[PDB]
Every structure is written in C-alpha cells, then in structure tokens.
C-alpha cells in the first residue's frame, strides 16, 4: 500500500512579525518537498532527487498553492483567537494534515483532512468523506460554514481524484527509491542489570519502509506485558531503526526469542541469544 | 501535489 501526506504548521509569534509557516510533503516515509516562510527562497523546495525532474510549471504551481495556504492560515490564527477569546500576546499553533492512501493496485483506499489547534483536535473530515467531526463549539462554527459552502464535495474531488493521480505519478517517477524495500539488519545485545537478571535488546537497523513489528516470546508466548519498545527512529540516510528489550533471569536467556516482521522479509525472523 | 482549497476556519 502507499500514501501521500502534506503536514502544515502555522505558529503565531507575538511582536516578531508574520507567523511561522512550515509545509512538508511525504510519499510513504520519504519526504519529497518543503516550504519554510523563514527561508530565503520563498519557494516550494525539493527534498528527494526524483521530484527535481519536475519542470517550472510544477514548481511555480506548488509554490503558489503553498503560499496561498500560508495566507489562509495567517487569517485562521486570527479567527481562532476570536472563537476562543484569546489575545495576540500568546503564541498559538494551527496544525493541518491531508492526503490519500492507495492499495497494492494503486486504487483509492481513503482520504484525510484534519486540523489541530494548540495540540488538540479541531475539525476532521470523517472517513466517509461527506461529513465533519468538530471536536468543540468553536469547531462547530467552522463545521456549519463548511456544510453551507459544500466544502466536502470539492475536498472529496481532490482526495479521491487529484491526490491519487499525484501519488501514482510520484510512485512511477521515484520508483527506484519509493517502490524499494530495505529488509532489517538484526542483532541482539546482552547487559547484566543485577547478578540475578539481564536485558536482551533486539535491534532492527537500516530498514525501509518504517512499518515493522518486534515481539519477544518466552517459551513461544508473547511477552508484550514486559517488553520495552522504543519509537521507530530515522537513521538520517532514508532508513529506520528500532529496538525491543526484555529483562530475563541470568542463565535463562535462551528461553527468549525476538520476532521481526517487515515488508522486506519473505519470512518473519527469529533471533535467540548466542554466547 | 497540493490541494487548492480556499476554505478558512
């Protein structure tokens, strides 16, 4: 399956001029564009080699669209201050995300369009692409305006149509980087914590895409109660890293197996501690 | 490619 996502952050800056506006575009777990209101270019910029092929018509249009969104969000910061009876003295944040998922056949699976204000859900397009979830009374005002103006109809045309057409174009043009899998390189480490117990840490390195499952078993039974799993983290080269740990009795290391599932593996891996 | 929606909150 595949996704295209855009992420927008708009932050008011009391007494320091215009709000900060940052936009980033992803296909799956690969960033391909950025815009930053504070950068010198004032253009949508490439962040993957495969999007650099797109010509001036693409770059001028994406620049015009991202700057138009920054203008909308500058007004929205003001509107949200009115709805929540907030002064200009405070810094506030609007977050916005939209995009589309497709299946293995590159056919539409679902669409997203949602906003947060100051880290909380504000308004979201429901999964049926025809109705809104308004998280509070402020967001109900927005919801009523968007119902009266038939916003869902025009947004649905983008999410089901245009968004999928872009994703297919990008999946074709970037196929060498976007349609690849890098299977995890795995190893285990051992650390004494007491005289009577030790940590086994199961490592997954250099994998793509980010989606992975690490599971610990004791005698073939999932240990999800007593496993610590760290957030999947970027290596910085376009691949990801993760580890899962368990505390075990010293002398009983070989009762435990680590299980790794990843798109890039024909079969799940099973690791066990080796002196 | 980006959405072209003109809708304000």
């Amino acid at each position, epitope marked *: 399956s595949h996704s295209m996502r855009y992420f927008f952050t708009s932050v008011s800056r009391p007494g320091r001029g215009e709000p900060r506006f940052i936009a980033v575009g992803y296909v799956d777990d690969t960033q391909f564009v950025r815009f930053d209101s504070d950068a010198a270019s004032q253009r949508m910029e490439p962040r993957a080699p495969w999007i650099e092929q797109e010509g001036p018509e693409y770059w001028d*249009g*994406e620049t015009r669209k991202v700057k138009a969104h920054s203008q909308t969000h500058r*007004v929205d910061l003001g509107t949200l201050r009115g709805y929540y009876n907030q002064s200009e003295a405070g810094s506030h944040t609007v977050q916005r995300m939209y995009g589309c998922d497709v299946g293995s056949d590159w056919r539409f699976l679902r669409g997203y369009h949602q906003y947060a204000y100051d880290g909380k859900d504000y308004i979201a397009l429901k999964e049926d692409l025809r109705s809104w979830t308004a998280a509070d009374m402020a967001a109900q005002t927005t919801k009523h305006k968007w119902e009266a103006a038939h*916003v869902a109809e025009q947004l649905r*045309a983008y999410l089901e149509g245009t968004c999928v057409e872009w994703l297919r174009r990008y999946l074709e043009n970037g196929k060498e980087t976007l349609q690849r899998t890098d299977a995890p390189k795995t190893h285990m480490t051992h650390h004494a914590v007491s005289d009577h117990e030790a940590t086994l840490r199961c490592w997954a390195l250099s994998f793509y895409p980010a989606e992975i499952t690490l599971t610990w078993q004791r005698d073939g039974e999932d240990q999800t109660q007593d496993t610590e799993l760290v957030e999947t983290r970027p290596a910085g080269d376009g691949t990801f890293q993760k580890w899962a740990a368990v505390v075990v009795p010293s002398g009983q290391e070989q009762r435990y197996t680590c299980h790794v599932q990843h798109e890039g593996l024909p079969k799940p891996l099973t690791l066990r501690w080796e002196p | 490619g980006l959405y*072209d929606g*003109m809708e304000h909150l």
Partner: T-cell receptor
Amino acid sequence: AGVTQTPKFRVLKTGQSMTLLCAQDMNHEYMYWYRQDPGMGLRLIHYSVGEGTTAKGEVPDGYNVSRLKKQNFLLGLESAAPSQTSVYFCASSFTDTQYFGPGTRLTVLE
Amino acid sequence: KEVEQNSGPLSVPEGAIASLNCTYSDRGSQSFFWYRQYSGKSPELIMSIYSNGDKEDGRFTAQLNKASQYVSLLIRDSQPSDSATYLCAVRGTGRRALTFGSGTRLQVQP
C-alpha cells in the same frame, strides 16, 4: 442583503473621480471587482483575499481598490477616461463560488 | 485565451438539448463553474463541478473532462426562458480568483 453595489448608474466628465462601493453581509474573505464590455465578457480588475490585502486582476490599470474593512471592497477611479465606460460587477465568495452584485453602469463623456 | 467559449449565438428549438462548451489552458485547475446572465442582469451560478464526470441539477447537466481540458453544460428540454448568455469560469492552479470566458449567447426559439 447579499452583495450590494452603489451607485447603480453614473455619468462622469473625462477627468472626474469616483468610488464604487461593494458591500456583503456574508462574512466572506474573498471579494472581486470586474468590468464587462461586449466582445470581452467579464474581466477581473482587482480582488482581495481578506481585510487589508488586495491583488491585481487581469485589467488593473487606471483603477485602485481598498479593503480597510472585511464587509466592503472599494473601487477608485482617480481620473475617468472614455475607455472606463463599462458595467462594473463586484462579487464575494466564502470559497470559490462567487455571488455577484447588481452592477454599476458608468458612462464617461468629454 | 485561458478560458475559451464560442460567442454563438447558439439557436435551438424549444425542447431540444442546448450544449454549451468550454476549454481551459491550466491543466491543474480544480474548480469549474457555469453562470447564467440575462440581458442587463447579474451573473447567477447555475452549476459548479470539481470531479471528472457528470453532475445533474434539474434540467442542467455539467460534464468535466480534465484529460481533454473540456467542460460542458447541457440544458435538457430547453425553454424560451433559458435564452441568456452562459459564462464558463475556471480557477487555475494556486489561483484565488475565477477566470471567466466571454460567454455563449443561447436563443431558445418558442
């Protein structure tokens, strides 16, 4: 009200000045001034995406605009020329669906 | 040039289909509108369309073909009261304003 325009009709001598007033009571961020002449259809003069911002349309030359207040969009003719003889329509939108005012017929004579 | 319509006039007998056609240059355009204008009156929205395909509203059908950059309005069972100028409007890529065609005059003969 929807979208209102004043005046409806005006004759000007070449070199006289006037302001056309567009008002809307719908809380629309977007407002538009057009002219319409036989052969040419509607041509955008200036538009505004919100209070305190304006932008040039297709035929901005000889016209100015202001949007000091969200509810009003003013079109200014500093020095009327016979070429500015036209029907002027203003419009507003919440998104891209435009609602038009009733039009202002202007004739400029020597 | 950005939005093309034939001026007509297009003459059709009462009860025939009227097909009003429009083409546009900007391939990324996301919004398309048909307005009706009676002589001496304001443009009035009759249809909007966003997705490739058909949209029906009483005797009106709009059809959009994005690959051919072609949009149509069909009036079914055309009536003398449909006699008017029909304006095609398109919103280009990243645009915050409509571009109008110069319109097609429809004359529906009783």
